[PDB]
Amino acid sequence: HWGYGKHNGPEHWHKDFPIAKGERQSPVDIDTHTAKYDPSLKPLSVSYDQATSLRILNNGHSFQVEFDDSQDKAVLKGGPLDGTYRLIQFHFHWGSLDGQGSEHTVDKKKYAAELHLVHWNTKYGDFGKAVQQPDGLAVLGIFLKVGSAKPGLQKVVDVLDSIKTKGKSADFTNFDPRGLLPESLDYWTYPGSLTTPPLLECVTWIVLKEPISVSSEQVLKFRKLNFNGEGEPEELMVDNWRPAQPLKNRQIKASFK
Template structure:
């Protein structure tokens, strides 16, 4: 997960040994305790925001954020209080099965998208990173299919303009309309306490990973794979391998109850 650029004194392997709740992880849904009593997740001001967003190729990923301080918010589920949207970004690789960071029941996908939020009580992402309840990241797994998904049209238009590193374009909030699903609040997910997936791997994240993958066209996904890094070559892989799942690293499978009509 890309939060900021930072030089690290230790290698990723050395840091992992010093921590107990590293991300991402491979999850077996059958082994997870199941909860069905949590309040639905509440997404406010994402795809229906009147403010435009900025889509940037930062040399590591495609990075989306809003131009204004009027940012979306997330509540409910396993979260206590309100979390403020900071940015969205993507992970992928060269094939359609190893581009996701989290793995559910041994099934890999073509890509993974992360919506990064900070706890509003800390007032900024930078301040929140230092606290165990500082961040909440919602993850969507992308499944590559032959037919394009029209919900991605606005985002694809933006990706076409940021092939080179440091290129940025203005995009409407409708670029997030692919997540505007009538069953979003009724979809099952897993949640656990973990870490950033890039240095310094701080353990400050409440992860929320939706079980049902989002379908994206193979050609649409190809635009992510064409984004260029610092060497002006396509970024072929930007995922961290799954980390060891130690005892006591609790993962909860949340089954959302469908609303009664």
């Protein structure tokens, strides 16, 4: 099965998932001088005040916080989207060192981690149907840089001990994802894919220009997680990021100049 090690890592994925070499793979490097400003682009609409978190899971590749998506509780609209997209989960990608960890890069700069807020287009009825559609998902990508602590992240950091190994989960209610957003919602956007198998090309990527700051201590706890299950040999969960893929026939658009 796939992973991020020396024998099952991203360069190997294409043997089981040939779309890995597809035309709209993610992530990509955002070249800030060739991104096109598009005034036609609307502001993002983030409506998370009614969000309902349920659970946090070590899924063996990352950890994810899951939400109730049976109704329009927490949705993303606007930006380059038509239709409304419900929040289903968020997760992170991070590095073994502060100089790497993000999936997207900006002018080849890497950040310490990257947060993905995953949303699916309600017109398709359920998540499994949405991932088979070119406009099925919208993922909000937020960069993390090491500096001052982020108060809104600490509730997450504090429960990681409880889900240290693969398949562990814990109740995680009343978490407000608004505490994870930057002040500005300016963004870049491009059509792309899931960055983990099955790598389906169903994602409208929305990557925020402004990073959020987290402390060294906060990102250190991420690095204490395990890829393995309980009772197995310990392998620390680090460097669970895919490198940049060729842009090919695509234009990155910016909502700002």
